[PDB]
Amino acid sequence: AVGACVLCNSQTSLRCGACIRRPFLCCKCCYDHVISTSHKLVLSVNPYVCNAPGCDVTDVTQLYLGGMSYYCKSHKPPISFPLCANGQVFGLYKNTCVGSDNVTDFNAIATCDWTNAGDYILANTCTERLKLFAAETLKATEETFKLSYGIATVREVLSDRELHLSWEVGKPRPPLNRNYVFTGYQIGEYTFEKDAVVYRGTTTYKLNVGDYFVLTSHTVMPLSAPTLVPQEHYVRITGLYPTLNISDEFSSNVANYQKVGMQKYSTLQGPPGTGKSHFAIGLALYYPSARIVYTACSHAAVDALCEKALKYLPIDKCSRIIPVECFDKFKVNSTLEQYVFCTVNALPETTADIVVFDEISMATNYDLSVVNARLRAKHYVYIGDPAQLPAPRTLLTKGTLEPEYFNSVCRLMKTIGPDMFLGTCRRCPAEIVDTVSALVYDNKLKAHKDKSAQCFKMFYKGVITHDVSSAINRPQIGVVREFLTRNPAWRKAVFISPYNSQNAVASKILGLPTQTVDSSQGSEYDYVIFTQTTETAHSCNVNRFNVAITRAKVGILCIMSDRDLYDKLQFTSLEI
Ligand SMILES: Nc1ncnc2c1ncn2[C@@H]1O[C@H](COP(=O)(O)OP(=O)(O)O)[C@@H](O)[C@H]1O
Ligand SMILES: Nc1ncnc2c1ncn2[C@@H]1O[C@H](COP(=O)(O)OP(=O)(O)O)[C@@H](O)[C@H]1O
Ligand SMILES: [Zn+2]
Numbered sequence: 204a205v206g207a208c209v210l211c212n213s214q215t216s217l218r219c220g221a222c223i224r225r226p227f228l229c230c231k232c233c234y235d236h237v238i239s240t241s242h243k244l245v246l247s248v249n250p251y252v253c254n255a256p257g258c259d260v261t262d263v264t265q266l267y268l269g270g271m272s273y274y275c276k277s278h279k280p281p282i283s284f285p286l287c288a289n290g291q292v293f294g295l296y297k298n299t300c301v302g303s304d305n306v307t308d309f310n311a312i313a314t315c316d317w318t319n320a321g322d323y324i325l326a327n328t329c330t331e332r333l334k335l336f337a338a339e340t341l342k343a344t345e346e347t348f349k350l351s352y353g354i355a356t357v358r359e360v361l362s363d364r365e366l367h368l369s370w371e372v373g374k375p376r377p378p379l380n381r382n383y384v385f386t387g388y389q390i391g392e393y394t395f396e397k398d399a400v401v402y403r404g405t406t407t408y409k410l411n412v413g414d415y416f417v418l419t420s421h422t423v424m425p426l427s428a429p430t431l432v433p434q435e436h437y438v439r440i441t442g443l444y445p446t447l448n449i450s451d452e453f454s455s456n457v458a459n460y461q462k463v464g465m466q467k468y469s470t471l472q473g474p475p476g477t478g479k480s481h482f483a484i485g486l487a488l489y490y491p492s493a494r495i496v497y498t499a500c501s502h503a504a505v506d507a508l509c510e511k512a513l514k515y516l517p518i519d520k521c522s523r524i525i526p527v528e529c530f531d532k533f534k535v536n537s538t539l540e541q542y543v544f545c546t547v548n549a550l551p552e553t554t555a556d557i558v559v560f561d562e563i564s565m566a567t568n569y570d571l572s573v574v575n576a577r578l579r580a581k582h583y584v585y586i587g588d589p590a591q592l593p594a595p596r597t598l599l600t601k602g603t604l605e606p607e608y609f610n611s612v613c614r615l616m617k618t619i620g621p622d623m624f625l626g627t628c629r630r631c632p633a634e635i636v637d638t639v640s641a642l643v644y645d646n647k648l649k650a651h652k653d654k655s656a657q658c659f660k661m662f663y664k665g666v667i668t669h670d671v672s673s674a675i676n677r678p679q680i681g682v683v684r685e686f687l688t689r690n691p692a693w694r695k696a697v698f699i700s701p702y703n704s705q706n707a708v709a710s711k712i713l714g715l716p717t718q719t720v721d722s723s724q725g726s727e728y729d730y731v732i733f734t735q736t737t738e739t740a741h742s743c744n745v746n747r748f749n750v751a752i753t754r755a756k757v758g759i760l761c762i763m764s765d766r767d768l769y770d771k772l773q774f775t776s777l778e779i
């Protein structure tokens with residue numbers, strides 16, 4: 204009942220009872236909260252409510268201190284004082300209170316519903332203490348909203364991978380994609396996709412009629428550590444001990460490795476195929492005695508760091524921390540190993556000489572705080588690319604979230620700039636590099652490869668159907684099918700689109716492996732076939748387009764719906 208104010212850290216006995224997270228607010232910050240918002244319930248050792256029998260007055264602006272108890276205007280004794288007075292709510296430490304000038308930010312964070320991009324902008328431009336309050340409050344809203352969806356019950360099972368579902372009436376249905384993971388009843392986690400639904404479970408299980416699936420609402424724990432520790436700059440490499448000689452394969456990074464050792468935290472922007480994993484593992488080779496924790500939000504990102512480490516680091520010194528199918532070539536759950544590879548959600552409480560946090564565009568401020576709370580490190584290295592994709596914000600429906608508001612690290616990379624930048628793309632044909640360099644990298648990304656002369660574009664609007672909110676463009680797929688008959692080397696291509704439903708139709712008609720742009724991030728393929736499917740904000744987002752066309756190592760075919768993006772592609776145009 205006694206804590207530190209969320210705005211100014213002053214000691215207080217007050218909490219807002221209307222906020223979902225019930226933050227501490229000092230006497231001065233609490234007044235500015237209740238006097239400007241619909242939040243009028245204040246909590247202390249005892250709740251600020253009228254204590255007379257039968258009275259239901261809970262609005263603190265209508266309550267008075269009489270004796271040691273609280274009463275409304277109709278019940279208060281003659282010798283009383285208002286709880287709200289002199290810009291201050293009565294509590295404890297009323298004289299120590301310092302107040303704050305950012306209460307208008309607090310009030311917006313505390314009262315918003317997280318459906319507007321402007322809510323996320325404020326959550327990333329406020330003070331550090333407010334960033335934590337916003338992250339906790341958003342996550343709580345996301346989890347509680349997951350209870351509003353209807354339950355799905357198995358009516359009949361058609362095969363080992365398809366079934367028919369019944370949906371609870373009166374409640375809305377969750378989208379059927381690989382992002383919405385359901386818990387079965389605990390028969391394990393299940394995902395569904397599109398009559399019949401295709402189902403996928405972590406384990407094979409005999410699914411009976413009546414079994415049900417629900418979205419799993421995770422409880423939300425309070426944050427304590429900042430999203431970024433306060434920065435420090437050192438006069439020399441601190442806590443690290445460089446090798447005498449490093450293999451020339453990594454020598455081009457030595458100046459950046461020295462910079463890592465000379466400040467508390469460092470940021471590295473690495474465009475697609477510029478060597479982010481190579482950099483991260485080279486760090487271990489340059490500081491061979493350093494204990495390094497490699498982390499990221501997704502198992503796929505951790506696994507990729509593992510694959511690189513397997514080639515360059517001693518296998519006996521590595522461990523993959525596993526609470527799905529993860530990398531299996533290291534010892535599992537050996538927390539004490541020199542090199543530990545772990546997703547953020549599974550991090551143990553440990554110390555390290557260096558923490559490497561990869562795929563930073565996909566992190567939220569909640570993730571950044573958890574990493575700092577769990578990992579006490581001498582140095583922190585944030586690796587990623589604000590021109591790539593962010594974590595989905597399930598509640599956001601109004602407005603687009605720009606990269607400078609993805610999280611605290613992306614914000615720094617977009618305002619003051621990254622500490623380090625890998626400027627040579629080694630993966631893609633020059634036609635692609637030149638396109639994305641101008642599109643999102645201010646022309647600073649260089650191509651190592653030549654033009655491939657296997658990069659093609661076609662403008663074809665087609666016909667857009669929809670399966671709920673997922674779009675399908677069958678004519679665009681028909682164009683691809685005709686292209687394949689004439690370009691047989693592309694039978695090994697991967698089909699990519701912004702929409703799951705389009706991928707499902709392409710899979711059936713074309714037979715190629717398919718991937719959504721978002722799922723493709725971090726992967727590379729020789730040949731890519733991309734169908735824009737529609738012209739929407741989703742399908743024209745430059746970050747998403749950047750990711751889509753930089754998957755290719757040799758050739759890409761883009762079937763485009765949007766004239767502006769089509770014209771930017773520095774590809775040979777095809778006719779048909
Ligand atoms: N890999 C190493 N090579 C050489 N000297 C080391 C190494 N690791 C630690 N030391 C020495 O031992 C001291 C104690 O190590 P430690 O407690 O980790 O301090 P620090 O955080 O400064 O490395 C260091 O200050 C340094 O003088
Ligand atoms: N500075 C460098 N010196 C030598 N080889 C490099 C360098 N940077 C990258 N490479 C090579 O090119 C590859 C680029 O691919 P990758 O590291 O997966 O890029 P990213 O992780 O940024 O997608 C590296 O794995 C490595 O094989
Ligand atoms: Zn409140």
Ligand SMILES: [Zn+2]
Binds near residue numbers: 208301
């Ligand atoms: Zn305060």
Ligand SMILES: [Zn+2]
Binds near residue numbers: 253274278
């Ligand atoms: Zn009363």
